[PDB]
Design a protein around this ligand. Structure first.
Ligand SMILES: [Ca+2]
Length: 222
């Protein structure tokens, strides 16, 4: 009756792909999940307390940040992405050297234990996120007609350097780089379910000529 509106964030990782179309990392929730089984989405999830702590050690600020919680939510998005697909995006040290390697299976497994695992892994290394590599592209609150509600902050970043996503555990049954047009058609046709914000991001990416133009202009309006 008095539904929690859960703060969350999602990361839309893109690259310039085949046929001059943008490609994006998507994941699919396993049929065994209790909430939204089989839904396609981008990596993301609920805010954790260590997210704002890591944001205070971060470099820079998200492009098109408008609110005081944008740095913490950018971190939420980056953390959830590392847990889901095994890559830590936008990491650097004090000298500006970028991390460009994936997490080993064991480090991804350790990050999925939750708590302050990511904050600890970064702080043992003197590393932090460069939030300047993310663009705030939207904010969506689930309609009050829904029994489970989120207030989700969407960020965009470019992953032209990334290899393949790697899963940990059973929550997701698939993860891949897909042209945004391909995925959109599959949702519009009814083949795969997706929440409204997911569709609206895919349509924005399809209208966009390339990843540089997206990092300069992308915005999802309700
Ligand atoms: Ca997640």
């Amino acid at each position: 009756a008095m539904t929690d509106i859960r703060k969350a964030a999602t990361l839309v990782v893109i690259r310039d792909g085949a046929n001059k179309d943008i490609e994006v990392l998507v994941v699919r929730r396993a049929k065994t999940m209790r909430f939204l089984p089989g839904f396609v989405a981008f990596p993301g999830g609920a805010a954790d307390p260590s997210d704002a702590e890591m944001a205070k050690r971060a470099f820079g600020r998200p492009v098109c940040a408008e609110d005081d919680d944008d740095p913490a939510l950018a971190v939420t998005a980056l953390r959830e992405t590392a847990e889901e697909i095994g890559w830590l995006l936008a990491v650097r040290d004090g000298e500006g050297t970028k991390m460009d390697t994936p997490l080993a299976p064991d480090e991804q497994a350790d990050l999925c234990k939750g708590g302050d695992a990511l904050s600890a892994w970064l702080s043992a290394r003197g590393l932090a996120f460069d939030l300047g590599l993310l663009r705030r592209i939207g904010r969506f609150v689930t309609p009050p007609t829904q029994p489970v509600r989120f207030d989700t902050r969407f960020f965009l970043c470019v992953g032209q350097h990334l290899g393949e996503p790697r899963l940990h555990g059973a929550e997701l049954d698939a993860a891949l780089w897909t042209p945004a047009r391909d995925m959109l058609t599959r949702i519009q046709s009814g083949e795969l379910p997706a929440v409204r914000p997911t569709i609206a991001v895919l349509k924005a990416l399809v209208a966009c000529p390339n990843a540089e133009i997206a990092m300069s202009t992308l915005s999802i309006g309700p």
